Amino acid sequence: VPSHRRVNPPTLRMKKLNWQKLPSNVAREHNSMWASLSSPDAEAVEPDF
Amino acid sequence: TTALVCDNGSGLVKAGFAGDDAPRAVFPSIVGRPRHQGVMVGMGQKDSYVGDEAQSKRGILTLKYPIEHGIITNWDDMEKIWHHTFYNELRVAPEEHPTLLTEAPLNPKANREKMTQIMFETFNVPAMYVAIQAVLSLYASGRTTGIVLDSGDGVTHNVPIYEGYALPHAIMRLDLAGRDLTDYLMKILTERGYSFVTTAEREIVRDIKEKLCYVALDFENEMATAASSSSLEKSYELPDGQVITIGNERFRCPETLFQPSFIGMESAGIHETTYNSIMKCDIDIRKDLYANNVMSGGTTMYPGIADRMQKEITALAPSTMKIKIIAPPERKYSVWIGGSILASLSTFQQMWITKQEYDEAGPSIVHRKCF
Numbered sequence: 268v269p270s271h272r273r274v275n276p277p278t279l280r281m282k283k284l285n286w287q288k289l290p291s292n293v294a295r296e297h298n299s300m301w302a303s304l305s306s307p308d309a310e311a312v313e314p315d316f
Numbered sequence: 317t318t319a320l321v322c323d324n325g326s327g328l329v330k331a332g333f334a335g336d337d338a339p340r341a342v343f344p345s346i347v348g349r350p351r352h353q354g355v356m357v358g359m360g361q362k363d364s365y366v367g368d369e370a371q372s373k374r375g376i377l378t379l380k381y382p383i384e385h386g387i388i389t390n391w392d393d394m395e396k397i398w399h400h401t402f403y404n405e406l407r408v409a410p411e412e413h414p415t416l417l418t419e420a421p422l423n424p425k426a427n428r429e430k431m432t433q434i435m436f437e438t439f440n441v442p443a444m445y446v447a448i449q450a451v452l453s454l455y456a457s458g459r460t461t462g463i464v465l466d467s468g469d470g471v472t473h474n475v476p477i478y479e480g481y482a483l484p485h486a487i488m489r490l491d492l493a494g495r496d497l498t499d500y501l502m503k504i505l506t507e508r509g510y511s512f513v514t515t516a517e518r519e520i521v522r523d524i525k526e527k528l529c530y531v532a533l534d535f536e537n538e539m540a541t542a543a544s545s546s547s548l549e550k551s552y553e554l555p556d557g558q559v560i561t562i563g564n565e566r567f568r569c570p571e572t573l574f575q576p577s578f579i580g581m582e583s584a585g586i587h588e589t590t591y592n593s594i595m596k597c598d599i600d601i602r603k604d605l606y607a608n609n610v611m612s613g614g615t616t617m618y619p620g621i622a623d624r625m626q627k628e629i630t631a632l633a634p635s636t637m638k639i640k641i642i643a644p645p646e647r648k649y650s651v652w653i654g655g656s657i658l659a660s661l662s663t664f665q666q667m668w669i670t671k672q673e674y675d676e677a678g679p680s681i682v683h684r685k686c687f
């Protein structure tokens with residue numbers, strides 16, 4: 268379930284945080300943390316956008 | 317719209333408006349923090365003095381250099397340096413003026429990432445540019461080709477450029493420049509009984525180095541002349557009124573540039589660095605680099621460095637072709653002058669880095685754009 272990807276668009280312009288983006292197939296492996304975080308039963312913390 | 321040229325060197329930040337000949341704001345890059353206790357309440361006792369204020373009140377200030385060996389180590393200090401050079405020195409809004417900047421060769425990429433992120437998030441500009449210091453020095457020399465020995469305060473790097481192509485493999489770097497000469501001058505002044513241990517005293521010894529030191533044309537003859545006669549002794553007045561007199565230390569201190577075994581480095585002098593840079597080039601283009609030995613940086617301000625440099629290369633290189641040293645009088649600011657040349661060009665409008673390019677491609681388009 269793509270809970271973290273469901274981000275509303277904001278109306279203003281934002282400073283871009285720099286990192287190195289992982290590939291989607293690498294993050295969605297069975298023993299990665301990101302697939303376990305992709306579960307709907309995971310504790311989704313909502314940030315104040 | 318006038319651009320801004322601001323060489324953020326290791327030694328002194330040199331900034332001013334583009335299209336001009338001289339930088340308006342030359343000031344050393346130090347952040348001074350008070351080490352003692354304040355008792356006098358009021359009158360704007362600000363906790364971190366930057367630039368000329370830190371130079372003037374330096375007797376109660378621990379001084380820190382944000383740029384060490386050509387690498388921006390402390391970042392908040394460098395942000396304070398940029399804030400002082402934009403808001404207090406030039407007194408211009410960054411959001412309405414392009415800002416040219418300079419950089420050392422073989423730099424880390426994340427350094428360029430961080431400088432791009434500061435120049436687009438904190439100090440917002442319409443456009444900016446990062447260039448190699450040797451390339452701008454060659455541009456201010458008026459020649460497209462040549463080899464540049466740029467010796468600043470931390471880095472002495474050799475860069476050969478042929479027809480605008482800066483050869484990457486032939487670039488080398490020697491970590492021996494003006495601050496190391498100042499530390500060695502602190503070490504050898506204790507033989508005469510003068511002690512300089514604090515960072516405030518480093519500016520005094522640096523001023524001694526700037527005012528009195530000179531490159532010997534022959535080292536052993538200057539040893540023989542100094543040991544024989546006391547004619548080359550020169551006196552200097554300290555800020556407290558005391559007068560010292562120095563002898564051979566006027567030319568033992570720049571001789572570290574030719575003999576790094578004084579401070580204990582296995583590498584040879586800048587001549588061997590230049591020569592080994594020359595053999596890394598193609599054999600067709602070596603002839604042009606011999607006649608185009610350009611210097612920049614204030615560590616080349618000693619008034620015996622050109623003839624000694626020509627002697628050292630002519631000893632090193634074969635004597636079949638011509639050796640020539642390009643040493644202009646304004647090669648201290650030739651980085652800034654080359655930036656002012658490059659900023660006001662009609663072609664240079666299409667190599668600017670816009671905010672739209674920043675928003676599309678992160679702080680990472682500087683790698684694929686610039687060399």
Ligand SMILES: Nc1ncnc2c1ncn2[C@@H]1O[C@H](COP(=O)(O)OP(=O)(O)O)[C@@H](O)[C@H]1O
Pocket residue numbers: 324325326327328329467468469470494495522525526527612613614615616617618648
């Ligand atoms: N007149 C001079 N004579 C000898 N050395 C100088 C002179 N002026 C400056 N220097 C030295 O060269 C350096 C000049 O700084 P510069 O090369 O312009 O930028 P940076 O060294 O900070 O990259 C200073 O650190 C200083 O020690």
Ligand SMILES: [Mg+2]
Pocket residue numbers: 323324325326327328468469613
């Ligand atoms: Mg410099």
